[PDB]
């Protein structure tokens, strides 16, 4: 049991990486989609 | 990044928490157990004499 | 019956009734196994009496703990990976 808390503590750091890098991904993606639909706004007042 | 960190589990932190929590009152079980065995071979040895 | 050491008695004596919430949290070891030593007019055939119900007691607990011990790690054995 010891030893399988020391690999969880492990995995542990291992999930606040993640955890991060995947909040970045997510904000990245609503970001570049926001532009998105500022292009389509854009572009539909251009017609 | 996604690619890198595919494989992580889940849920480890209240794992974490709760299993030390839990490991500790085991452990002071098996201290308390100990020494109950040592007051139990005093007494039989006691009553022996 | 009536006594504040009764549960030892049931327990040397017919042991069945005992459950797994009276020999829990009912007794303090180390104080009882204190109280044997001193106790005026100790009957020696109720000393070993009194000396199996204790043991056995102690027995109960340790396998209790055996079995918790088992369980829990059963428990953490879980993961969850997504892929």
């Known amino acids: ?47 | 990044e996604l690619k890198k960190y595919s494989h992580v589990n889940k849920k480890a932190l209240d794992q974490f928490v709760n299993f030390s929590e839990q490991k500790e009152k085991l452990i002071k079980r098996q201290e308390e157990l100990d020494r109950g065995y040592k007051s139990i071979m005093e007494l039989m040895n006691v009553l022996e004499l | 019956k009536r006594g504040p050491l009764a549960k030892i008695w049931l327990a040397a004596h017919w042991d069945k009734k005992l459950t797994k919430a009276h020999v829990f949290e009912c007794n303090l070891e180390s104080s009882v196994e204190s109280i044997i030593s001193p106790k005026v007019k100790m009957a020696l055939r109720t000393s070993g009496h009194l000396l199996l119900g204790v043991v056995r007691i102690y027995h109960r607990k340790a396998k209790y703990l055996l079995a918790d011990c088992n369980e829990a790690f059963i428990k953490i054995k879980m993961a969850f990976r997504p892929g």
Do not use: P, S, V
Request: charged residues 45%.
């Open chain 1, 1 to 47: 049991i010891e030893e399988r808390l020391h690999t969880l503590e492990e995995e542990k750091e291992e999930l606040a990486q993640y955890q991060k890098w995947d909040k970045m991904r997510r904000a990245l993606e609503y970001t570049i989609y926001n532009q998105e639909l500022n292009e389509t706004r854009a572009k539909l007042d251009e017609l």
